[PDB]
Design a protein around this ligand. Structure first.
Ligand code: FAD
Ligand code: FAD
Ligand code: MTE
Ligand code: MTE
Ligand code: 141
Ligand code: 141
Ligand code: MOS
Ligand code: FES
Ligand code: FES
Ligand code: FES
Ligand code: FES
Ligand code: CA
Lengths: 760, 450, 49, 48, 450, 49
């Protein structure tokens, strides 16, 4: 079943509005609703906290403060704490300071605004330089990795390019907002939330309430979008909900209004990247030296892994004999940044990407050959390594880009464009090609495990359950498909159930594009046990050997006789053979050392390429993507439709990141862009007018679920091509380095134009 | 107060006790959980529902629209898009077959927009869906769906609503209005409500003394006059767009990017004006083409040139009890051209809105109407530039040479949308555009085909 | 569980076999999506089995 | 642990009225409630 | 109409719109879901709750008790038996320690009964608990728990409730009553309401025009008189029982098996009588001891001997607006002996209840009052049997020889509780028991010790 | 401490279990077989009046 383009498991339900998300679930009439009241300072001591106006507000029932917290007060996904309710001082504008449970969402919102709070302000750190200045950082100092000796390499280099440039963050904007609900259930709680990580929600709620893990059960059936935004900031909602619940005696739900959501949660780490890169006379890179300043926010969240991944991707798609990264994870008084599709990767990649382009302009070379010339070697003595020392044995980049350029009519188009430009004085088109190599697996190694539990009922139908969470990316269907493929029956007999830490325990968050790779195995593992039992039984019964019992298309065949799967199961039931099983999986071959920067942190890499073409307006910088062509490698895809879709969506999101998406804070730290009316994701019409997406269809070298390949994050990096192209257009307008910053808003583009035009 | 309307085929009567409640909330509180809330601010579309009445049917956002507004209309939410017998609408199967959904959450929204589009056979998808953001799919698979389903007979069950109907003040006539407003100067007049609802949903405000104007047929008319066209304050921006398509393509071209179809369908020109925002997109254009505005108080009736309506940021030439009743536009103004610059093209707020109108005496500049939005606490013409422009030759260089004047006409702000340098530089940039455009050069990025 | 002590006895067996104190083991509701195809609890055979 | 005389798993909850049985579970306001109407005949054909 | 009471320590004011609703329902709909419903009929105890007022504290069935009845009272349900800081009540720990619960469902009720007994240091458990059925444990573990908790100081937190209070009609004095009833002869009087609630819960009946008598202190008194004791109609069977323990041990003995303590604490003798059932257990005994009954209408006051109040099954000597006000008992009657006979000893309805009182002129039978419930449409003395009995010697054989006269006095029916022949034979048997008893021989099974 | 360590070593901490009573076989219609694993016994002496 694996391999066919079947629709998402809740397609119909989405499309008629029966699919329920969290705020849709029915709940008792006495359910309360909650809202945080937030700090209005970027950095201060809290000096007075009068809440009387709060308690007195209509419909309100309980109000909460760090002191009311019965046990832990900490939602951080990492060993250093992050209070859920402020403990004496605040650190960014948005930080929740107390919590309100009233008889209605509005009510709670309204009350949250009546507090009388006095602060003793303090100097605030809002910018990388400020941070740098004040040595405000995480991990007691920057992280440095080095392979070879760069300064040597670069001092003696025929060509060179130094450059510095800004990469702005990005707000997830998941259509369904953060949200959760908790229901006291004799002794313990049951939380429903919209999170990518129920096993953690469990852990944090448990600690928040002083309960052993077994007294807390998180169920989560679907999220309306997550993109990393829900890898951890689901914690504050769950904690508050469980805590209000334990106190008031009653169910408590909490959902952030959009404005709150954007102000409180984190975003993608914005980066400043400073690079020197250099090459040979023939164009082979000689070395690249990089410094990453990354804006993490006021607490650790997942900065640690994120910045590790960006370093880990600083080689972009190329082999480089010497390469250095110095990675500062700067602490600042603003939203605590966190995961976002790509998890650092795009930042590191775009780093190398910008440079190599700068390099190419420098030597009047065509960027594309320059790249193509430095891709890692194809597979099949001594294989090349990355700067962290992992052999790259499966890079099909050379082949693929070639194939893409042909199919995209790359060369010819390039000319048509030059011409067209030369005849225009107000508009310029530009086009670029960018590649992608992304590694698969958590860099924090022991997260790479998954479990599934499978049940077959006497009427032959099946209930599948696994650790992943469906956030729109088709995970469940793939897992259904794998299961139906391994048991030999039609998918229709397989039903998916909601994710539930009481059914599969100790899960990792659904992330690192590892949802399907791993859960897939786990389910397969369960289904294999089950199938095993069936064959054993059939065999003894029909005298003969298990391995000749065949399950296919809903039918079982043995010794010339054949029966319907149901008929087999019923009979195993009568025979008393267990029809239930768990299954589990752990990614092999991984080992690496973060501090040393050496090892094999990944199983295999994902690749792909994209050629985008755009036009810009020389007067105002207005601009847009006319056409894009992608060719991306999803292994032996488990579901081509489902994959094409992630590819298309990711691309858009990726581009979105480098074009109109822009975060802005005011001089006092306030988030100015905190609502769709001022934070602008790709709207329907920004879709490329011609959008060709196709897949490289080749098995994965490594032994993954049906030789497929993760496909959720990788494709997000194809967005770079858009930025690259945007920059090709500026370059066409003058002979200077456009030095286009990201995000490329029109103001930004217009600025690049002028530089290149030499008008300042 | 009691109102009635059709809800997914069924007749419904409701006791309004809070006239300010949004349609989005009645709905979910009735358990019609299908309409999602995604921002509650007008931009996402996730709350899109379909209303209908004599003018036909359109899709609008439930989050902006308050109850009293749907009196006597027929409403259709996502849960009633499919036929009673369970058959999917061609638009849903389409979305299913084409993978138009991933996370699901933006879907009911698109389906309702798609359906309503289907019902009227409209096919301008990019503009029709501008107002439905989806963060998951890239949009592409959604266009396929729309296309694929357009070759399919309209849903009969959805047209049957046509046969229908055949605390807070609800005037039916401009007179009734003027009388009452006069007595309650301090009341809160709600038209489209697309700016007013954010006061309740975001500023958490509470408005007592309220009146809804969308039931005054006579305030929402388009009248041909001896000397121009008479536009009633209650005219919807979509409507205004439709009408302009003829005599004022430029204006029409601008409105195309005035919010989204979902807001345009109920947002009013009166409103856009009465709001008084220096980023309104109506006023600049209208001022450029020099229209006039008509106020009204009881039976009295002033009447200035539009630009004069705006004194200072946040303050207008409006008397207690006085209300906007219409505006008047010339029968023609080929000189008009309008520029809207924002971070993103569709559904976005102007960094700067450039509206230009120049009359020629062959090669010579006779008259210069030049207006801008977003470069000052108010929309206003750019006098010094205008001035310095009269009489000179109409070539690029003259204009090039007057630009600096703009920096005296205005001294723009800086903020999340764009930096003052840029807003400035851009205003200037608009005028170069205007010459290059009139001189037949290619200039607009949105007209380039791949 | 219908009053007959089955869940304690089951918690007890579990705690014994795992070598930890019973307090560490919590019972959950009987749920057919968790253990399937069960017989009714009867025949005085709840615990034996 | 097997072998010791330990209390029933829900004894504290029995004894303070916290153990919930089916009619104690909280349920949505809109929940409906049912009842059968019964035959009053030992054996007959239902005619109307 | 609004009433007030203390609920598990907290003051609560409630708006009564339906005065007939039961405490068991308010309780659940408030969500105090710990009080179970197991028969809704009074027999199981599973809904037992504890009330308290100035007479002290008692455990009663909430399924029989309507709301207006707890006004000014202090209500404790299972959820409030443990102290506020979480400490379990001695009785709870005991139950846990001695395994006094298996299924759990009958537990909150036993706890409530147990606690209330502990509150007053009462120790007659078989009686205190007859009204809490449990199907799982065999009762033994519960008696161990009861026993082990009695050695433990009373809960202070439950005693603090004593400090408290210090449409549907609610008379505070017999006068107010008599007046009002007179004007509303058709009204439904409710005293204890242990007979009337089954009209609402099982017959599903609906009563309008209702008055509650339990708030007339003056209607519930026991007064010493020149020639007897004057018992108010509102006096409870529990109360009556307690008073008779001295001067009328036989009546007391009987009342020990009259329903259960839970019912006994609110059921009244007036009601027992006004209900007029031929199985009521009161009347036969009072008749045998020859008590008289006083009725009352406005200010008027009749007064017959009790047996005469019952005319026919389901029909009494009661006039429109007339109500039962008291009964009067002699100061003594050593000859009374009362027999209850049922399927099971405790909390059961009588198949036959026989009461006998004989006075003697040394070895000779002077007077003989002999009355039976359950053998006719009405409680009645056994005239033919009585008659043939006077003048004869009080030996077993003379009684033996008069037995057939009972077949003439009564023609008993047959029903699920017992067949006619058994009822008859039993009546006869009771007479024989009476001689045997008074003659000093062992005869009651309930007094044999293992 | 053992458990956490295993989790970090990536060892599944979840498992199902199953059981079927042995030795049974019997035939209703003939009234022959072993329909039972074993027999429960006891005795009671009651005294009444
Ligand atoms: C999602 C979104 C996108 C938007 N995009 C744009 C856009 O691109 N360009 C733009 O200019 N605006 C935009 N807006 C805001 C825009 O001004 C309003 O949506 C609209 O034009 C006002 O129409 P309305 O009737 O809803 O005004 P209302 O909300 O009904 O409010 C009008 C304001 O003026 C008052 N008023 C209304 N009618 C009268 C009357 N006739 N006489 C006196 N006072 C009156 C009302 O009291 C209120 O004070 C957008 C808003 C949202 C919701
Ligand atoms: C579980 C259970 C067990 C029972 N066991 C027995 C049993 O052992 N033996 C037995 O005899 N009975 C038994 N009964 C019922 C017995 O009548 C009542 O339980 C009690 O004696 C009636 O008292 P009451 O105050 O509740 O009468 P109510 O229920 O209040 O009503 C009795 C009738 O009298 C009317 N009434 C009440 N007071 C007056 C007044 N003074 N003047 C005129 N009319 C009045 C009421 O309108 C009603 O018609 C049992 C009932 C239950 C629920
Ligand atoms: N439609 C949709 N796709 C998505 C997301 C989402 O929230 N919605 N989250 C992304 C992120 S951050 C990851 S890490 C992968 C997860 O895919 P997977 O489960 O198979 O690993 O989903 C990507 N694709
Ligand atoms: N307290 C209590 N004990 C009980 C019952 C019950 O409902 N409650 N059911 C009986 C019946 S019919 C059986 S078959 C056994 C079940 O014992 P086992 O489950 O451990 O097989 O409960 C016996 N003992
Ligand atoms: O290496 C990681 N990659 C991730 N992608 N999305 C979430 C991730 C995470 O925790 N770690
Ligand atoms: O043999 C059986 N004995 C039983 N006891 N309680 C239920 C039983 C059953 O299904 N079968
Ligand atoms: Mo990925 O970024 S959860
Ligand atoms: S909620 Fe987003 S437009 Fe209504
Ligand atoms: S499917 Fe997720 S937003 Fe549209
Ligand atoms: S429920 Fe059985 S006695 Fe009240
Ligand atoms: S414990 Fe089950 S009825 Fe008593
Ligand atoms: Ca976020």
């Amino acid at each position: 079943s694996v391999g066919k383009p079947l629709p998402h498991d809740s397609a119909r339900a989405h499309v008629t509005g029966q699919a329920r998300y969290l705020d849709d679930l029915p709940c008792p009439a006495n359910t309360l609703h909650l809202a945080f009241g937030l700090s209005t300072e970027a950095s201060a001591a809290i000096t007075g906290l009068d809440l009387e106006p709060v308690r007195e507000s209509p419909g309100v029932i309980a109000v909460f403060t760090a002191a009311d917290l019965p046990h832990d007060n900490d939602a951080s996904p990492a060993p250093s704490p992050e209070p859920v309710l402020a403990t004496g001082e605040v650190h960014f504008v948005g930080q929740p300071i107390f919590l309100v449970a009233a008889t209605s969402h509005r009510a709670a919102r309204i009350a949250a605004r009546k507090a009388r709070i006095t602060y003793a302000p303090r100097p605030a750190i809002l910018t990388l330089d400020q941070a740098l200045a004040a040595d405000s950082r995480f991990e007691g100092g920057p992280v440095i990795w080095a392979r070879g000796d760069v300064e040597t390499a670069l001092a003696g280099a025929a060509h060179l390019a130094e450059g510095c440039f800004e990469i702005g963050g990005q707000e997830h904007f998941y259509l369904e907002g953060q949200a959760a609900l908790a229901l006291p259930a004799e002794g313990g709680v049951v939380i429903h939330c919209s999170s990518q990580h129920p096993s953690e929600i469990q852990h944090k709620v448990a600690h928040a309430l002083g309960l052993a893990f077994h007294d807390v059960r998180v169920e989560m059936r679907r999220m309306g979008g997550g993109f990393g935004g829900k890898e951890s900031q689901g914690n504050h909602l769950a904690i508050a909900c469980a805590v209000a619940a334990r106190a008031t005696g009653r169910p408590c739900k909490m959902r952030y209004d959009r404005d709150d959501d954007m102000v409180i949660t984190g975003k993608r780490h914005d980066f400043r990247i400073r690079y020197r890169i250099g090459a040979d006379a023939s164009g082979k890179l000689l070395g690249a030296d990089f410094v990453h300043l990354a804006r993490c926010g006021w607490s650790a969240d997942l900065s640690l892994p994120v910045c590790d991944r960006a370093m880990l991707h600083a080689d972009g798609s190329y082999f480089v004999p010497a390469l250095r990264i110095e990675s500062h994870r700067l602490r600042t008084n603003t939203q605590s940044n966190t995961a976002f599709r790509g998890f650092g990767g795009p930042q590191g990649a775009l780093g190398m990407e910008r440079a190599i382009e700068h390099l190419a302009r420098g030597m009047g070379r065509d960027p594309a050959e320059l790249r193509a010339l430095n891709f890692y070697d194809p597979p099949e003595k001594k294989t090349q390594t990355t700067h962290y020392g992992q052999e790259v044995a499966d890079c099909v980049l050379g082949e693929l880009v070639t194939r893409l350029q042909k199919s995209a009519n790359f060369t010819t188009r390039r000319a048509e464009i030059a011409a067209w430009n030369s005849t225009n004085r107000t508009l310029a088109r530009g086009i670029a090609l960018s590649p992608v190599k992304f590694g698969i697996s958590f860099t924090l190694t022991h997260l790479n495990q998954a479990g599934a539990l499978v049940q077959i009922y006497t009427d032959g139908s099946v209930a599948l359950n696994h650790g992943g969470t469906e956030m729109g990316q088709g995970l469940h269907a793939k897992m259904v498909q794998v299961a139906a493929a391994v048991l030999g029956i039609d998918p229709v007999q397989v039903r998916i159930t909601a994710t539930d830490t009481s059914k599969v325990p100790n899960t990792s968050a659904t992330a690192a594009s590892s949802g399907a790779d791993m859960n897939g195995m786990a389910v397969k593992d369960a289904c294999e046990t089950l199938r095993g039992r069936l064959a054993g039984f059939v065999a003894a019964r029909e005298g003969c050997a298990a391995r000749d019992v065949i399950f296919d298309a809903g039918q079982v065949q043995a010794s010339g006789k054949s029966w319907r799967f149901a008929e087999i199961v019923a009979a195993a039931y009568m025979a008393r053979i267990s029809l239930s099983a768990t299954g589990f999986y752990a990614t092999p071959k991984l080992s690496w050392d973060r501090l040393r920067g050496q090892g094999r942190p990944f199983l295999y890499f994902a690749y792909g390429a994209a050629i985008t073409e755009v036009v810009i307006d020389r007067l105002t910088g207005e601009n847009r993507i006319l056409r894009t062509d992608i060719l991306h490698d999803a292994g032996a895809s488990l579901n081509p439709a489902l994959d094409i879709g992630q590819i298309e969506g990711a691309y858009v999101q990726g581009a979105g990141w480098l074009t109109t998406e822009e975060l802005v804070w005011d001089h006092c730290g306030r988030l100015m862009t905190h609502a769709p009316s001022t934070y602008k994701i790709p709207a329907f019409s920004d879709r490329p007018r011609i959008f060709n997406v196709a897949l490289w269809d080749q098995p994965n070298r490594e032994e993954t679920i049906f030789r497929s390949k993760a496909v959720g994050e990788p494709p997000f990096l194809l967005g770079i091509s858009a930025f690259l192209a945007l920059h090709d257009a500026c370059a066409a307008c003058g002979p200077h380095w456009p030095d286009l910053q990201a995000p490329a808003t029109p103001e930004a583009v217009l600025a690049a134009v002028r530089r290149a035009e030499g008008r300042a | 107060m009691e109102i009635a309307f059709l809800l997914n085929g069924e007749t419904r009567r409701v006791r309004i006790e809070d006239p300010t409640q949004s349609l989005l909330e009645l709905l979910r509180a009735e358990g019609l959980t299908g309409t999602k809330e995604g921002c509650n601010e007008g931009d996402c579309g996730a709350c899109t529902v379909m209303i209908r009445d004599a003018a036909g049917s359109r899709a609008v956002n439930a989050c902006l629209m308050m109850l009293p507004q749907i009196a006597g209309k027929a409403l259709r939410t996502i849960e009633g898009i499919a036929a009673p017998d369970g058959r999917l609408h061609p638009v849903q199967q389409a979305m299913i077959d084409h993978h138009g959904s991933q996370c699901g959450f933006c879907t009911p929204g698109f389906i309702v927009s798609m359906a309503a589009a289907h019902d009227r056979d409209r096919k301008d998808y990019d503009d029709l869906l501008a107002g439905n953001l989806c963060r998951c799919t890239g949009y592409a698979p959604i266009l396929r769906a729309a296309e694929a389903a357009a070759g399919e007979p309209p849903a009969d069950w959805l047209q049957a609503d046509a046969a229908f109907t055949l605390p807070a003040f609800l005037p039916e006539t401009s007179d009734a209005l003027a009388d009452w407003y006069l007595a309650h100067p301090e009341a809160t007049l709600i038209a489209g409500g697309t700016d007013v609802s954010l006061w309740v949903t975001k500023a958490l405000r509470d408005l007592p003394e309220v009146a809804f104007l969308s039931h005054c047929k006579d305030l929402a008319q388009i009248r041909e006059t001896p000397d121009g066209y008479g536009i009633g304050a209650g005219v919807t921006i979509a409507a205004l767009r439709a009408f302009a398509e003829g005599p004022h393509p430029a204006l029409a071209g601008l409105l195309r990017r005035f919010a989204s179809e979902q807001v345009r369908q109920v947002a009013t020109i009166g409103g856009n004006i009465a709001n008084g925002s220096p980023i309104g997109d109506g006023p600049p254009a209208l001022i450029a083409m020099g229209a006039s505005l008509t106020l009204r108080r009881g039976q009295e009736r002033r009447r200035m040139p539009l630009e004069d309506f705006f004194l200072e940021y946040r303050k207008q030439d409006r008397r207690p009890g006085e209300f906007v009743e219409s505006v008047t536009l010339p029968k023609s103004a080929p000189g008009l051209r309008c520029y809207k610059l924002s971070k993103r093209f569709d559904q976005d707020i102007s960094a700067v809105c450039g509206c230009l109108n120049l009359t020629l005496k062959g090669s010579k500049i006779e008259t210069a109407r030049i207006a801008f939005g977003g470069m000052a606490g108010v929309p206003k013409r750019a006098a010094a530039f205008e001035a310095a422009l009269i009489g000179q030759d109409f070539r690029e260089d003259t204009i090039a040479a007057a630009l600096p004047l703009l920096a005296q006409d205005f001294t723009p702000l800086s903020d999340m949308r764009a930096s003052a340098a840029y807003r400035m530089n851009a205003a200037q940039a608009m005028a170069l555009r205007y010459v290059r455009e009139l001189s037949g050069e290619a200039v607009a990025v949105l007209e380039v085909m791949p």
